[PDB]
Design a protein around this ligand. Structure first.
Ligand code: HEM
Ligand code: HEM
Ligand SMILES: C[C@H](O)[C@H](O)[C@H]1CNc2nc(N)[nH]c(=O)c2N1
Ligand SMILES: C[C@H](O)[C@H](O)[C@H]1CNc2nc(N)[nH]c(=O)c2N1
Ligand SMILES: CCS/C(N)=N\c1ccc(C(F)(F)F)cc1
Ligand SMILES: CCS/C(N)=N\c1ccc(C(F)(F)F)cc1
Ligand SMILES: [Zn+2]
Lengths: 410, 407
């Protein structure tokens, strides 16, 4: 088979063959497309085949397929699975797996950096305090004083599903959200529920607008525990505008390190329920979504008012106008504090190059157009005019139920 | 089965059942999503006809009635004899309105039922087509107070007597390649603009030259016609705060009228069915004006705004784009020509979606196309999950007439 993909701005056409290897489902039938849908204990028998194909890829990637080292590793793994039911990955395999989970993330526009990933092996970790230490070292290393470095910390793989390691926070660093009895929300609305669990667990909220939440860490299936990330480790950027000297008075700021912590990493059948990973922000994530979504900080009106814009009628495009300035401010601020960050133009342009490269070296690049195209100025970024094929490849990062909706408390 | 759709901004969940009536395939499988790909007989005809009539009568609360049954046999017998059939007026009107209603890429379907239908089925020549088209352009333009409409020429028979409108839209600017190697006018129509020259049209070689209509009737060869200039309402683009804007020398037409698609009703194929409504701002401001492959004007507009175009991180492109779309909307409103902005259009569509879900049990929607090409996440449709599937009657793409015609 062969599937063609065309870019309507360059007339460039690409041939995808990589999709042939996709085994997982898409949520789409032949009679329906669910492309815009947000979220559409393995047994030993189910496990070996998964390990095999994975190990086949690995060895193939190091140009040693069929070798003796390859066969013996298969024999070694098969045996281990039969006797122990599970199986431990080699350090080289773990690093290969993680980079590929990233490499296969169809919703990630920053994959051009996929091979530059620092992997921290936290498989010997046994307690929550242990997880805390590991996370602090990840935050410090990745931040690097503003010169951000991609990194991922991998805790023990799931066993019987009763001794899972979970990082309850959705991101290592995030601002608390509090619901007021008057119905309004102070802080970040998106984190209200998690904030409550933290308070309910003993956290003492400063009840402010940008309070870095504490970590809630679950080790070996035990009840989660609270820890406060060392402030001197949480790099933040106050947001000011290059021309609007009143912007700083808006009292805005954001953290510099985006580190996802609620996803599950799958490598050769194994499941790593705790695998926080971080990179660096694309401006629009903060400028458009975090600040302007109606269900987030929702700063449009206040930014507009101060800009003195005709807010009487939408057709004046006051919302659009204010959005640009706000995103202007985010990029400017980060660049001024020498904290890594990329704008949607550069990010989407690099992604197009990475995508083409991937087609010519792997035979494809699974991509989710709904997620790749930026939440602003969509059509003036190259990805918009790019047809994409979305399919599933492992290793991979997946979502998992929120830990508070499944955890069996002790 | 029973699929649900959630809006992540309001948490509202709607259940979709309408998809269970999907006929055609989407191009997507369980192994791959083709969502962003722009385009993935007596025995055949009667079932389709029955499906349609069934829906029609169901809508008029006469499902099963003798009328329903009689009509069914009548068509059945007609197909057995004439190897095809004709729609009664009522069924044509319904068919066309419903083709619009099922257009998963149209953001303005909230207007679906308010569609004027012009039966051009008695047309036999190109001059006739021209007459029908002119009256359509005039009725729909209504001096700026646009009214949606569609004109339906004779349905296909043997495929060699197909009626076709070679233009992609009734009104579009010509595209000429210059000595340089660049392009004057609209790069999107360069080829058609060539087929018009290669046909006789005397191209004035201007930036915004309204192309001539190239009509084809009963499989014959296309003929050129110049739409009465008095019938082509145009808006000169000026800015509400940049009096230098007028100097960009930009203008666009007020009437968007798609004419290269094919209308299918009850198995029947109407290869010539121009339809029009009114512009959503972004269409011109973002796509026609700023698309790199189109008029690509961001370069200059930025200059004139005196902004740092040194680093992409200054978002000068974004900055310009906004002002430009301010101007388009501003101009149209000032000349009282109908136009809608992306904020209002999308808000309207969300409401339409909510009505369609409780009245029809669903609303086919293509997210990739529904979300405006600018300020995506600040419009409601961005946070709205959508289910895409095909339903007939429908509007479909069809091969360019020049790439398939036997002169
Ligand atoms: C180097 C900086 C990086 C940039 C600029 C980048 C940018 C992005 C952006 C803009 C999104 C969408 C986020 C949202 O809308 O919530 C995304 C999604 C994603 N990225 Fe990256 N990324 C980078 C690094 C990484 C790293 C290091 C990994 C993994 C090791 C990764 C894995 C993912 C995944 C799994 C998704 C999709 C998640 C989902 O399906 O919900 N990214 N990335
Ligand atoms: C009255 C106001 C209308 C508005 C504001 C509206 C707006 C839109 C917009 C923004 C698009 C995208 C255009 C593009 O990107 O090329 C679109 C697509 C579409 N609209 Fe509407 N529309 C309206 C009327 C109509 C009418 C009267 C019909 C049919 C009778 C219709 C049929 C379609 C079709 C079929 C498409 C998608 C075509 C395809 O699949 O490529 N629209 N519309
Ligand atoms: C409903 C729709 O799927 C949803 O709003 C998606 C659209 N595209 C997105 N794209 C990115 N990068 N991030 C998101 O959260 C979303 N949300
Ligand atoms: C490649 C991608 O499908 C293509 O650029 C689509 C995206 N969304 C669109 N949406 C609308 N309304 N109109 C278009 O022409 C497109 N082009
Ligand atoms: C890993 C830091 S890379 C980055 N730029 N940000 C995000 C933010 C959210 C997600 C998601 F997983 F929540 F979608 C993914 C990447
Ligand atoms: C019918 C006028 S309704 C409108 N706003 N414009 C368009 C423009 C192009 C198309 C398309 F068919 F080319 F995609 C559809 C609608
Ligand atoms: Zn799909």
């Amino acid at each position: 088979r062969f599937l063609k993909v065309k870019n309507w701005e360059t007339d460039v056409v690409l041939t995808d063959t990589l999709h042939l290897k996709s085994t997982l489902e898409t949520g789409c039938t032949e009679h329906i497309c669910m492309g815009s849908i947000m979220l559409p204990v393995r047994t030993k028998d189910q496990l070996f085949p998964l390990a095999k194909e994975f190990l086949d890829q690995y060895y193939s990637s190091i140009k040693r397929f069929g070798s003796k080292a390859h066969m013996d590793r298969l024999e070694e793994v098969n045996k281990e699975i039969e006797s122990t039911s599970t199986y431990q990955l080699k350090d080289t395999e773990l690093i290969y797996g993680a980079k590929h989970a990233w490499r296969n993330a169809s919703r990630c526009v920053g994959r051009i950096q996929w091979s530059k990933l620092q992997v921290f092996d936290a498989r010997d970790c046994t307690t929550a305090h242990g997880m805390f230490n590991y996370i602090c070292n990840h935050v410090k290393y990745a931040t690097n004083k503003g010169n951000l470095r991609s990194a991922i910390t991998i805790f023990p793989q799931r066993t019987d599903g009763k001794h899972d390691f979970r990082v309850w926070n959705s991101q290592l660093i995030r601002y608390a959200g509090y619901k007021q009895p008057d119905g309004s929300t102070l802080g970040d609305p998106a984190n209200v529920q998690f904030t409550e669990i933290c308070i309910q667990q003993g956290w003492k909220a400063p009840r402010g607008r940008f309070d870095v939440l504490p970590l809630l860490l679950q080790a070996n299936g035990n009840d989660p525990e609270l820890f406060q990330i060392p402030p001197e480790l949480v790099l933040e950027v106050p947001i000011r505008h290059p021309k609007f000297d009143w912007f700083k008075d808006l009292g805005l700021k954001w953290y510099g390190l985006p580190a996802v912590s609620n996803m599950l990493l799958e490598i050769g059948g194994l499941e790593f329920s705790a695998c926080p990973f971080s990179g660096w922000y694309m401006g629009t994530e903060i400028g458009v979504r975090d600040y302007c979504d109606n269900s987030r900080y929702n700063i449009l009106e206040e930014v507009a008012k101060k800009m003195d814009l005709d807010m009487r009628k939408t057709s004046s495009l006051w919302k659009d106008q204010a959005l640009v300035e706000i995103n202007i401010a985010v990029l400017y601020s980060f660049q001024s504090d020498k904290v890594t960050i990329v704008d949607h133009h550069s990010a989407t342009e690099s992604f197009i190059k990475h995508m083409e490269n991937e087609y010519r070296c792997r035979g494809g690049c699974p991509a989710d157009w709904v997620w790749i195209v930026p939440p602003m100025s969509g059509s003036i970024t190259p990805v918009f005019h790019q047809e994409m094929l979305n399919y599933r490849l492992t290793p991979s990062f997946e979502y998992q139920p929120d830990p508070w909706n499944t955890h069996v408390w002790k």
